[PDB]
Design an enzyme around this catalytic site. Structure first.
Site, mmCIF file in Angstrom:
data_model
loop_
_atom_site.group_PDB
_atom_site.id
_atom_site.type_symbol
_atom_site.label_atom_id
_atom_site.label_comp_id
_atom_site.label_asym_id
_atom_site.label_seq_id
_atom_site.Cartn_x
_atom_site.Cartn_y
_atom_site.Cartn_z
ATOM 1 N N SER A 1 0.849 -1.223 0.000
ATOM 2 C CA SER A 1 0.000 0.000 0.000
ATOM 3 C C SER A 1 0.869 1.252 0.000
ATOM 4 O O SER A 1 1.691 1.444 0.898
ATOM 5 C CB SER A 1 -0.937 -0.001 1.210
ATOM 6 O OG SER A 1 -1.766 -1.151 1.214
ATOM 7 N N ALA A 69 -0.731 -0.418 5.534
ATOM 8 C CA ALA A 69 -0.573 -1.591 6.390
ATOM 9 C C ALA A 69 0.256 -1.260 7.629
ATOM 10 O O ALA A 69 1.223 -0.496 7.554
ATOM 11 C CB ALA A 69 0.064 -2.732 5.610
ATOM 12 N N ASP A 73 4.769 -3.936 15.793
ATOM 13 C CA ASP A 73 4.470 -5.218 16.423
ATOM 14 C C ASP A 73 3.491 -5.068 17.584
ATOM 15 O O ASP A 73 3.726 -4.293 18.515
ATOM 16 C CB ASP A 73 5.757 -5.898 16.897
ATOM 17 C CG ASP A 73 5.544 -7.350 17.295
ATOM 18 O OD1 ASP A 73 4.575 -7.981 16.819
ATOM 19 O OD2 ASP A 73 6.358 -7.870 18.086
ATOM 20 N N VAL A 75 1.423 -8.227 18.261
ATOM 21 C CA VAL A 75 1.123 -9.622 18.577
ATOM 22 C C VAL A 75 2.390 -10.396 18.945
ATOM 23 O O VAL A 75 3.351 -10.447 18.171
ATOM 24 C CB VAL A 75 0.381 -10.331 17.410
ATOM 25 C CG1 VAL A 75 0.000 -11.754 17.795
ATOM 26 C CG2 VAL A 75 -0.865 -9.550 17.016
ATOM 27 N N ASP A 76 2.378 -10.988 20.139
ATOM 28 C CA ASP A 76 3.479 -11.818 20.623
ATOM 29 C C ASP A 76 3.011 -13.246 20.885
ATOM 30 O O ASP A 76 1.905 -13.462 21.388
ATOM 31 C CB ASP A 76 4.076 -11.229 21.907
ATOM 32 C CG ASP A 76 4.863 -9.947 21.664
ATOM 33 O OD1 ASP A 76 5.038 -9.544 20.493
ATOM 34 O OD2 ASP A 76 5.317 -9.341 22.657
ATOM 35 N N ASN A 241 4.587 0.717 2.710
ATOM 36 C CA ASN A 241 4.810 -0.450 3.581
ATOM 37 C C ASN A 241 6.218 -0.519 4.188
ATOM 38 O O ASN A 241 6.624 -1.554 4.724
ATOM 39 C CB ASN A 241 4.477 -1.762 2.848
ATOM 40 C CG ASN A 241 3.032 -1.829 2.364
ATOM 41 O OD1 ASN A 241 2.709 -2.626 1.481
ATOM 42 N ND2 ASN A 241 2.160 -1.000 2.939
ATOM 43 N N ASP A 252 8.534 -9.142 14.037
ATOM 44 C CA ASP A 252 8.702 -10.570 13.764
ATOM 45 C C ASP A 252 8.263 -10.951 12.349
ATOM 46 O O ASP A 252 8.740 -11.941 11.789
ATOM 47 C CB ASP A 252 7.949 -11.408 14.802
ATOM 48 C CG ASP A 252 6.465 -11.076 14.870
ATOM 49 O OD1 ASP A 252 5.715 -11.450 13.942
ATOM 50 O OD2 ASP A 252 6.043 -10.454 15.869
#
Ligand SMILES: [Ca+2]
Lengths: 551, 195
Positions: A1, A69, A73, A75-76, A241, A252
């Site tokens: 994007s 986008a 981070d 989410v772990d 992006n 990650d």
């Protein structure tokens, strides 16, 4: 994007221009839906993906806004130390803890109902079970419990009229996303709102954390930590992006380097001083057909031909690859020129010489891919520098700047040696494929496709109902342009193939099914009515509805 | 209590909704989406709430089912139900108005069979009424999960595990820092201007 904003100081006529191209993939019917909401505090115009009550891309006659986008981070994954005796127990602090379970009933047509069990830990729901290793991987999310809050914060940003009312709404956002600002006054801004967690120094960002209580989140980081850029001295804000801001480590899932697709738009800004509105719109024209991984390898190919002896071994295609502007050229097609074909097969051989010996068998497919657009093969909604290419680039600098702490993937062989061997192997592969004649080498031109099935693997329409045209464009699924002249509000959008996704029982389709498809192909743009005055004049059909709810 | 919602479409068939209340604004917005893309949104909700197998059945190889279990695993319905109920009267009417607006045109499909899309005949099933829970899920399944739920840690651990087996903890972790580097090159391309 991709998105690039311009300040009136860098524009000839002196108008704030924001152009956005969010790419989610091209689907039939259109991924985005255009809407103009008026009344009850709202006065917005534009389009939004799927059908959300909110508007991701549009303007309220006061300020415009884009989106991309999320590059941060949130989410772990935690690995719980499972009990060697019992599968449902995990080691958390002191001592053992039992998992929570809930049963979901999947309904299937023609067959009986299927039942499953979902296990849950203190962190979150599990994704993968490894019994022989004695470890289970749970997914803990920072935005968990704040789904509607992030939905409403994205909604109330439409009622905003200034940067201070834009910034405080971003503070309510929990999910990782990028927001963009542009007012009629001439100001442009950028923010990346996300509920950022503060991880301990023991935790590595790339690999899962210890799920035993020793390695936990210290808390949610403050809003000052969130990257924000308002009115840069350069007079423009570009994001494709890429990396959010300097000072932020790699996530990650996303990994960045000096070679980035952002340079394809920014390089166009360091040519002239002042650009016209039409010129800024023509930035998407070049960026679509231009090669991503060409600007960084070309200087590393110039020192090849020379002082390399002109003994014609090979230097046959090497001297030609230099005459390449890094652009897709259709003729049949069939790409006009053997430059892209040779460069594609050269990179493929570069992974074989350097990466394949060191990269394990399981993750070999992640680095063997070149990341090029193709005719028949299912290509992604956005073309990028492959993970194989990214390692080759930053290690190519490592030979120029030696480091004892780091290890060189080239090792024994120099840069010039491997690039020569890959060039010899690329020519040998194409000689047996398309003949010994070099000038006649060509690859099938990439076809831009609109698949009937969406991103998640579910048919949006009947099988076969697809649109396709030759020449793959590295654009967004929808292209919007908001120009703030001295008048001064002009919204212009383009979303293929059209507004209505209606198909009659007989087989005939809506007049607004293919009306935007041909307009999108020629990089053109349609005007959309913004104010209350001209919407009643340029109206085609009006329908009044009647409601009677109970408060 | 009776409110009128005037919906007006332009030259390119793009709707413009005029109302005075939160419930009315998204009623016409819900009505307009149902007219243009009815089948697309019916398959959208099922893709994020996990009911694709209910109408499409099993795939060539349980593709619609195996996936249907994957999407249901990602979210918890009980956590979202509380979040919607916690919203105020004007905030809930945004989602309820969208659900009632979509169902308004849907109820008209039963009355006149000529308004029914072709896709419903080919796949051979009847359309379902949209709820306020579905409207939220269409955003949570595509937005926040496919853009803010991207995870690649478990695969990175398996690579480091394999590299430490062949090259040891000394060289294996050294090569892991080259393939998946913790911090990017100190000179990348950033949105804000550095220094
Ligand atoms: Ca992580």
């Amino acid at each position: 994007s991709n998105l690039w904003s311009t300040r009136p100081e860098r524009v000839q006529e002196g108008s704030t221009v924001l152009i956005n191209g969010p790419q989610f993939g091209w689907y039939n019917p259109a991924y985005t839906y255009g809407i103009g909401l008026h009344g009850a505090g709202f006065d917005v115009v534009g389009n939004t993906p799927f059908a959300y009550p909110i508007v991701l891309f549009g303007t309220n006659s006061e300020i415009a806004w884009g989106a991309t986008a999320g590059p941060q981070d949130v989410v772990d994954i935690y690995q719980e130390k499972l009990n060697p005796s019992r599968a449902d127990q995990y080691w958390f602090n002191n001592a053992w803890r039992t998992m929570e379970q809930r049963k979901e009933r999947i309904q299937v047509r023609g067959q009986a109902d299927r039942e499953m069990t979902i296990w849950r830990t203190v962190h979150g729901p599990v994704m993968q079970f490894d019994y022989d290793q004695g470890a289970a991987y749970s997914k803990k999310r920072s935005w968990d419990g704040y789904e509607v809050q992030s939905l409403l914060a994205w909604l109330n940003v439409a009622k905003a009229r200034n940067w201070t009312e834009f910034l405080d709404q971003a503070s309510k956002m929990a999910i990782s996303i990028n927001w963009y600002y542009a007012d009629k006054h001439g100001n442009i801004g950028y923010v990346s709102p996300a509920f950022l967690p503060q991880r301990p120094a023991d935790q590595d960002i790339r690999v899962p954390a210890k799920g035993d209580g020793s390695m936990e989140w210290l808390g949610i980081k403050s809003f000052d930590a969130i990257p924000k850029a308002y009115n840069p001295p350069q007079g423009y804000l570009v994001n494709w992006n890429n990396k959010p801001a300097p000072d932020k480590t790699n996530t990650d899932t996303y990994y960045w380097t000096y070679g980035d697709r952002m340079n394809e738009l920014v390089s166009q800004y360091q040519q002239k001083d002042l650009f016209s509105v039409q010129e800024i719109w023509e930035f998407n024209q070049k960026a679509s057909y231009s090669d991503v991984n060409w600007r960084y390898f070309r200087p590393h190919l110039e020192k090849l031909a020379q002082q390399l002896p002109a003994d014609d071994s090979s230097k046959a295609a090497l001297t030609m690859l230099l005459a390449w502007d890094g652009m897709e050229q259709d003729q049949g097609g069939q790409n006009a020129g053997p430059a892209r074909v040779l460069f594609k097969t050269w990179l493929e051989e570069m992974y074989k010489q350097v990466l394949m010996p060191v990269v394990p068998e399981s993750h070999r497919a992640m680095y063997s891919q070149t990341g090029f657009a193709t005719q028949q093969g299912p290509n992604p909604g956005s073309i990028n520098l492959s993970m194989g290419t990214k390692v080759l680039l930053r290690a190519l600098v490592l030979e120029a700047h030696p480091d004892p702490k780091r290890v060189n993937v080239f090792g024994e062989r120099s840069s010039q040696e491997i690039m020569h061997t890959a060039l010899q192997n690329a020519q040998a592969r194409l000689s047996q494929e398309q003949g010994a004649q070099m000038a006649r080498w060509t690859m099938p031109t990439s076809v831009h496709r609109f698949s009937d099935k969406n991103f998640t693997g579910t048919p949006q329409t009947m099988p076969g109902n697809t649109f396709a045209f030759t020449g793959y464009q590295n654009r967004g699924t929808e292209n919007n342009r908001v120009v703030f002249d001295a008048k001064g509000v002009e919204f212009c959008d383009a979303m293929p193939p059209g507004q209505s996704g209606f198909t009659d029982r007989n087989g005939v389709r809506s007049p607004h099914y293919e009306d935007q498809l041909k307009l999108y192909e020629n990089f053109e743009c349609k005007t959309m009515d913004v104010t209350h005055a001209d919407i009643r004049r340029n109206a085609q059909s009006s329908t009044m509805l009647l409601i009677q709810p109970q408060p | 209590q009776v409110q009128s919602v005037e919906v007006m479409r332009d030259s390119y068939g793009v709707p413009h909704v005029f109302a005075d209340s939160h419930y009315g604004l998204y009623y016409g917005y819900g009505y307009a989406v149902a007219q243009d893309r009815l089948f697309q949104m019916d398959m959208a909700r099922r893709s994020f709430v996990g009911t694709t197998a209910a109408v499409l059945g099993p795939g060539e190889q349980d593709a619609y089912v195996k996936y249907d279990m994957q999407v249901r695993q990602n979210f918890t319905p009980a956590s979202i139900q509380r979040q919607i109920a916690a919203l105020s009267k004007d905030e809930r009417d945004i989602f309820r108005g969208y659900a009632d607006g979509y169902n308004a045109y849907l109820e008209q499909v039963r009355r006149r069979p000529e308004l029914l899309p072709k896709e419903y005949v080919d796949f051979d099933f009847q359309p379902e009424p949209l709820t306020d829970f579905d409207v939220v899920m269409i955003w949570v399944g595509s937005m926040a999960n496919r853009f803010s739920d991207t995870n690649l840690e478990v695969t990175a651990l398996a690579m480091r595990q394999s590299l430490e087996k062949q090259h040891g903890p000394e060289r294996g972790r050294a090569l892991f820092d080259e393939l998946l580097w913790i911090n990017d090159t100190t000179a990348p391309t950033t949105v804000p201007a550095p220094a």
